[PDB]
Write a protein that binds this ligand. Structure first.
Ligand code: PEB
Ligand code: PEB
Ligand code: PEB
Ligand code: PEB
Ligand code: CYC
Ligand code: CYC
Ligand code: CYC
Ligand code: CYC
Ligand code: CYC
Ligand code: CYC
Ligand code: CYC
Lengths: 172, 231, 162, 44, 96, 162, 172, 162, 162, 172
């Protein structure tokens, strides 16, 4: 997989180049954000079961057909596999957040997921609503200031919510 | 005595060498009892074997084999017997063998026990008659006793998807659990409690997916949280 | 890639887990070292052509038969000297990639994998490139923890050829 | 001893037959040593 | 509304469509914005990244533009490269 | 499903054999237990709503905090009381499904697989569902072998809940 | 796989219903004629070798181009594989006779079998002739009155004839 | 072996499960069929002196070359005649074991396992044993379900010989 | 155990590798954060009895049926109250073991592996232990990055129970 | 496998104790030794091909019976395994240096190595000679102050030499 420092090395090599001082100076701007990026994945990991079950509870309150007899999240083995899917997607968005780009999310999670749900009969447009409810549960948690020094991590909030958007358009 | 019928090979990644001394992050984590693991590390061998044979979605409490686990912790069975014992297990016959036919069950067990894709369609045809005439217990024994299994994994390594990513690349072949789920486009129709087979995206009058434009004050919001110190 | 970041994601994903503090500390140790490791890549890049044409001359001093002996494998022609200084710059550029990434990622993918099969086929002796890397190891001019980062990737390249 | 890792275990009769057959090729490397006197203008 | 909170990144807005709409500091994906070009090593016609040195295959998967769900993935099944050259005379006379 | 018909096919199927006289006796044993087993499944079907509402009231008497404590897991809402009686109807419907097929086939597939995972996620105590099944076990009013067949699957759900 | 009893259950679970009283009474009618159902698969199993080898012998008398050189049943390996295909299909019909429905016949035997014979080059219409030759051979045995009390099994025999007929149209 | 009692234990043992109601009805189907099985085993045991030497002569009447042709495989000698009568006594004794046990368990592990290699090696034909087995099915002299249970294991031995 | 040091060795032994700068930087990230986590384990150890008796009382205020309901699972007797404060001490002790080691290794081996079969069998509720751990998170009195380290292992124990 | 921090934790759980302040303050002394420990491991891993090759070449100089025809290092397949066995042991000693205790040297390298060498006929006393020649080749390198701050680290070279003695008495 690639991280954000390995994505610039692969672009540079493909043209047989060194890295200029302008490119190095933009990679040490990525290092200085290093402790605020680690606080964001720590807040998502530490609350990871309340992200998943509060947003699954919300998903069936407003789409109650999914848990009725004949639905897809009916019959508790399929209920447990439904919550497994939300923890899986939340796991790889957490991986793509420390890496700095979404390549481990792209081929280990989302690659072939839209075509998997069509072979199972799972509503892939309702999985995207499940990802979108974990999106703002995780954003409201990362904007929350508890346990953190004063300062700024607002360009990183907009980045974490973009991996949740990538995961949600790849499944519809 | 009815030998297996002959099929043709195909070009695949694992048939040919990667010249890779010092593998990287896509090396796929040998789980072996040849490293003498403790109790905390033999739990990781067991979870890796459950993930490989079952899905991640079939590692429920009602699925786990507690007595096959304790014979591995006492050095009575090998990892090749743990992998055989998971395929002949009652959860695997109920959730996977009963909702596939004989041709799609071969390609599940080739992908998950041998760690490679099928060569062609005739390889599914060639192996699906080992199931129908000898059972699952005869099919998994003639599949674990091939030279493809005993050379790659031996009898003390958990199988893995062999040679999935090429060393330069960032996009590799699809993982075998996302490529081949529990049941397919047949058994989907009405044999698995299903309706209507597709769904349009959810409509709403509060749009929820508005893209920001070039003068919006949240793109400059950066240092809005707090001003920097100094003089 | 053998980044400390992608090695942390891989140990969590081996057992299907979220990223705990075991893996966030591996990422944090990359950031504490990335200051000295990025000033080394800036200074090796700025002295690139000085170190490349110097290290090529040090191979022609220790191995003077490489400029005399006829054949395609030697630097006895104008094309063989262009392809020789191409290869010094290849080994130098991969070192600087490892300094901006952290850990021996780019050197394993782009340089070391398959090197032994190439150096046997085209009859390229690996002792030439060891002499060229020992020159850069003595002439980059850095000191402190910045040379300590730089030499750890010159030495890693020498252990693969040796 | 032939080379320092390759050897010949022969009987004391037949070890005379090994040494007196490579002195029987030492009389023809005394005869291709006159291939250096006719280096130029050999067969004219 | 215009993305104003850092709290509404998870609630309402998704991510910048084009890279001119990125956050203050970063690219469209969210990583830090780094200049694409470094110093070229071995400026040379025969040995070096000339104009016709063929593209890295690992430049797209490193981009993340090979995966269909990411915005960089352009599909060339409907672009002009997939249309038949009419100046080819094997294709004109057959299609006449 | 685990059924004495389908567990008899699936022992001849695993060896590629025709159904010998070994498996026709297993089908025969189902056919001469089915008379007492099918009258229990319709005596519980007709007496459903008496047994549902009484068993949910028997949970509320033993554990009266479940009607008072605020939160989504408890039946202290009008919504949570509807979801409690929905659950007792699930457990009672699976018992009548097992009696009409013989053996614990439908409740193994539809209820107990993944049951521990969703109890822990949604904070549902399995001691609640044991008390609701001890009510049904005492109050179905059946006798003879019709009560033996009924209590055989009430006790199965109790054994896997605890 | 499902029997006749679990077929009703799986259909009732997708509606969230208990079984009606006319569904229990239709199930207890299957139990009443359960002894006559077991006498049918006792006759078929006990002569199963003679059903296959007599109907295969009659298939090549009337289709003599299958065993001519170039034909699909010409070699030792292609001929013994024709015999075991008949013994597989005859085995999965008797699995559908004690179950009560054709759920083990469709899932384990007939699914994807028409496309397999098309890939092998096997003439699928002639496989249907061999199944129909096994149909009347085992119906003639099912109507035998030896070793049984005399009664009416004619609705059961017409069900066994429908399992062979389903196998013969699912293979061409 | 393959008793319905041991094939119900080994079913529940391969699932790590206590004996549910699926297995107890398989046991009770053995007990219902048992009194028609234990009387056929009792009837064939006492009538074995007639049914063996009656069936040995039924082979020599259909295949009279087995008494005249010289060689070790034929019963043209007193050694070969006494080993031919021994073979029919193996088939009859295995049927009475399958009636006592219930199901084709004893004659699978004792008789039919590896039998095709024995007939092919010692040149002796399986069609001789089928004519002997059709004699015992025609002359055991039972009726009811005592004959229908006894004929179910003669017909199993014929279906393995062809 | 899973520590940051044994997870760097295992990823280097899997690759057949010596300890590169990928792995030295990861062990160095452990040594940097170990100053903040060794004072969290020293401050949680010294104030342990204040935290155990407090956290057991916080369960009794929140779920007061556990002191009133009769039965062996509940803290209604004096025996069942000392078994509760025993268990709170087990959870607090494993958190200090993870702070000195780094990484959720001691409680993955001693506590969470087999925990759900204990709570199911003895009818213990995992919401009793979440309420106890949420007291210790709010009452340990740490601040800064010392509280950040302690709360990251409290929340790991809650996520295995939730 | 264990490190030194989890060695003291596995011993406190077996008696059900919290760690006392003395065991905590003895562990934070090991943390501030941590930069000097990473210098020793870096000094060995960067000279690893020359530790193996020189101490091999010094072994077949004083023991020429090993590489003489008939010896246990003749026929380069056996010569390639002697160089692998030297590299394996030096690899697992440097693993036990960052850990702090030899639990990874004991199980996945040294358990069963006297038993393996006695099965093959490898002279296990000559292996102990080769291990003690990589000991004083890397004790001499860890005492080299080139590119380090001059402080005192004599207690960790006496520790590193002990892991070489541990592997040398375990094969004889
Ligand atoms: C062990 C794993 C591990 C972590 C979890 C982090 C934890 C962490 N974060 C910060 C430090 C910080 N963390 C934040 C982050 C935030 N403050 C806010 O108000 C926001 C709510 C939130 C961002 C979303 C900020 C703003 C700083 C310090 C200011 C700065 O570095 O410029 C520091 C101290 C660095 C310093 O002193 O400069 C540490 C150790 N680092 C690690 O090594
Ligand atoms: C476990 C082993 C086992 C079997 C192999 C079957 C076979 C079988 N069927 C019947 C019992 C019966 N069998 C038949 C069947 C038939 N009558 C006909 O005229 C047709 C030829 C044929 C149907 C095709 C009928 C009609 C009865 C009912 C008895 C009667 O009507 O008098 C009985 C006796 C029980 C009784 O008298 O009711 C037995 C042993 N049942 C078993 O339990
Ligand atoms: C070792 C145990 C053992 C036994 C207990 C006997 C039991 C026995 N006797 C006969 C068979 C017989 N049994 C009798 C006996 C009698 N008939 C009468 O009229 C009298 C009342 C009674 C004697 C007191 C007769 C007359 C025959 C038939 C002739 C014969 O077979 O010798 C048969 C074969 C017929 C059958 O039952 O199917 C058997 C098993 N034989 C044994 O091998
Ligand atoms: C990324 C990889 C990585 C490394 C390689 C080390 C590198 C390193 N070593 C030291 C610092 C040091 N390193 C050593 C070790 C030695 N000095 C000697 O004279 C001996 C030859 C050798 C021990 C046998 C000593 C002794 C000090 C402290 C100086 C002193 O008091 O003598 C320091 C300064 C911090 C401190 O003072 O502790 C650093 C960064 N750290 C890392 O993070
Ligand atoms: C690591 C990357 C990865 C992903 C993402 C993944 C997804 C995945 N989800 C699956 C199933 C499932 N997915 C769902 C999910 C849902 N159903 C709904 O109604 C909801 C809308 C939704 C979530 C709440 C359900 C119910 C199943 C069970 C299908 C079944 O067996 O019936 C399956 C089928 C295989 C199986 O169940 O054994 C796969 C492969 N697998 C992977 O390996
Ligand atoms: C990015 C990683 C990378 C490396 C390291 C690399 C090496 C490399 N060097 C080569 C050739 C060569 N290399 C040299 C270099 C030398 N010969 C001498 O005498 C000098 C002493 C010495 C210069 C130090 C020469 C003369 C050739 C041409 C050999 C031939 O064409 O047969 C070739 C054959 C193809 C070619 O470039 O012409 C490869 C693949 N290629 C790579 O892609
Ligand atoms: C057919 C197999 C099957 C089972 C067993 C099953 C259980 C089940 N019970 C649930 C909820 C629930 N169950 C209850 C029930 C109770 N709480 C109380 O206080 C009462 C004492 C008790 C009634 C006995 C409540 C209140 C919820 C809602 C929990 C929540 O929304 O977070 C949920 C969450 C989704 C929902 O139904 O809203 C599942 C999946 N679902 C299934 O498909
Ligand atoms: C789902 C249960 C199931 C069935 C029923 C099944 C049938 C099946 N029949 C096959 C072949 C075959 N089947 C036949 C049979 C026939 N051809 C004829 O001409 C006759 C009309 C007919 C005999 C009545 C022949 C000739 C072959 C191919 C043998 C060969 O190509 O060597 C094969 C290919 C395997 C092989 O080459 O041996 C399969 C998989 N497989 C299954 O998994
Ligand atoms: C318990 C299971 C079991 C079976 C089934 C069995 C069969 C069996 N029959 C044999 C021989 C024989 N079987 C026969 C029998 C016959 N040949 C004829 O001409 C008659 C038609 C027919 C008698 C009905 C003869 C003549 C031999 C001697 C062949 C020889 O020794 O070469 C032999 C060779 C050893 C011997 O008995 O001398 C075996 C193993 N043995 C067993 O242990
Ligand atoms: C180190 C890892 C570890 C854990 C986690 C552990 C838990 C554990 N808690 C137990 C019991 C118990 N735990 C409790 C605790 C409580 N019940 C209440 O009502 C209170 C609300 C709550 C206290 C907070 C009680 C009352 C029992 C006794 C249950 C019984 O005896 O039936 C038992 C049964 C044996 C015994 O201790 O007597 C185990 C094994 N044991 C371990 O070795
Ligand atoms: C757990 C990690 C691990 C260890 C520790 C290990 C040891 C090991 N060393 C071996 C052989 C060997 N080891 C040596 C080494 C030597 N012989 C000498 O005379 C010298 C004194 C010394 C070299 C310095 C030789 C020559 C063989 C080959 C023996 C043979 O195949 O005949 C073999 C036999 C397999 C083979 O032939 O390669 C094993 C299993 N293997 C492992 O996987």
């Amino acid at each position: 997989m690639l991280d954000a420092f390995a994505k610039v090395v692969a672009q540079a090599d493909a043209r047989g180049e060194f890295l200029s001082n302008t490119q190095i100076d933009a990679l040490s701007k990525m290092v200085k954000e290093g402790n605020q990026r680690l606080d964001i994945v720590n807040k998502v990991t530490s609350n990871a079961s309340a992200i998943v079950t509060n947003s699954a509870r919300a998903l069936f309150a407003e789409q109650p057909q999914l848990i009725q007899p004949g639905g897809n999240a009916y019959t508790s083995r399929r209920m447990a596999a439904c919550l497994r899917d939300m923890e899986i997607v939340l796991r790889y968005v957490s991986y793509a957040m420390i890496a700095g780009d979404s390549s481990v999310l792209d081929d280990r999670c989302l690659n072939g997921l839209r075509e998997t749900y069509q072979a199972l009969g799972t509503p892939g447009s309702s999985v995207a609503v499940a990802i979108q409810k974990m999106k703002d549960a995780s954003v409201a948690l990362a904007n929350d200031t508890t346990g953190t020094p004063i300062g700024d991590c607002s360009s990183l909030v907009a980045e974490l919510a973009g991996y949740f958007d990538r995961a949600a358009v790849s499944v519809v | 005595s009815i030998p297996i019928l002959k099929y043709s090979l195909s070009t695949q990644n694992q048939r040919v060498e990667s010249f890779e001394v010092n593998p990287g992050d896509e090396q796929y984590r040998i789980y072996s009892t040849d490293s003498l693991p403790s109790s905390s590390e033999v739990d990781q061998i067991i979870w890796a074997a459950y993930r490989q044979i079952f899905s991640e979605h079939q590692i429920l409490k009602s699925t786990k084999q507690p007595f096959l686990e304790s014979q591995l912790r006492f050095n009575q069975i090998s990892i090749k017997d743990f992998i055989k014992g998971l395929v002949l297990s009652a959860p695997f016959r109920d959730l996977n063998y009963n909702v596939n036919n004989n041709y799609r069950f071969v390609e599940i067990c080739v992908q998950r026990v041998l760690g490679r894709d099928i060569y062609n369609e005739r390889e599914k045809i060639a192996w699906s008659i080992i199931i129908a005439t000898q059972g699952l217990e005869g099919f998994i024994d003639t599949l674990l006793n091939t030279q493809e299994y005993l050379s790659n994994f031996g009898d003390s390594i958990v199988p893995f998807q062999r040679r999935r990513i090429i060393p330069q690349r960032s996009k590799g072949e699809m993982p075998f659990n996302l490529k081949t789920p529990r049941y397919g486009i047949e058994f989907r129709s009405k044999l698995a409690a299903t309706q209507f087979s597709w769904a349009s995206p959810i409509r709403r009058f509060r749009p929820q997916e508005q893209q920001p434009k070039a003068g919006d004050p949240a793109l400059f919001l950066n240092m809005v949280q707090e001003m920097g110190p100094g003089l | 890639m053998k980044t400390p970041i992608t090695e942390a994601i891989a140990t969590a994903d081996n057992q299907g887990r979220f990223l705990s503090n075991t893996e966030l500390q591996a990422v944090n140790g990359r950031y504490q070292r990335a200051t000295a490791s990025l000033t080394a890549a800036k200074a090796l890049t700025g002295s690139a052509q000085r170190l490349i044409t110097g290290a090529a001359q040090a191979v022609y001093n220790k191995f003077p038969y490489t400029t005399q002996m006829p054949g395609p494998a030697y630097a006895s022609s104008a094309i063989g000297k262009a392809k020789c200084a191409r290869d010094i710059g290849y080994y130098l550029r991969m070192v600087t990639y490892c300094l901006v990434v952290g850990g021996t990622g780019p050197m394993d993918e782009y340089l070391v994998a398959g090197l032994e099969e190439i150096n046997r086929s085209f009859d390229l002796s690996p002792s030439w490139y060891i002499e060229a890397l020992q020159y850069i190891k003595n002439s980059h001019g850095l000191s402190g923890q910045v040379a300590n980062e730089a030499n750890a990737y010159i030495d890693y390249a020498i252990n693969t050829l040796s | 001893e032939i080379v320092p890792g390759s050897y010949m275990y022969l009987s004391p009769a037949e070890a005379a037959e090994y040494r007196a057959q490579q002195a029987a090729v030492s009389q023809v490397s005394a005869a291709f040593s006159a291939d250096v006197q006719s280096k130029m203008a050999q067969v004219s | 509304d215009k993305a104003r909170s850092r709290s509404d990144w998870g609630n309402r807005n998704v991510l910048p469509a084009s890279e001119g709409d990125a956050v203050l500091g970063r690219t469209a994906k969210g990583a830090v914005a780094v200049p694409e070009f470094g110093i070229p090593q071995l400026d040379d016609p025969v040995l070096g990244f000339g104009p016709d040195s063929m593209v890295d295959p690992r430049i797209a998967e490193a981009d993340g533009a090979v995966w269909r769900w990411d915005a960089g993935f352009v599909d060339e099944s409907m672009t002009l490269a997939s249309c038949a050259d009419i100046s080819d005379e094997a294709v004109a006379d057959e299609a006449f």
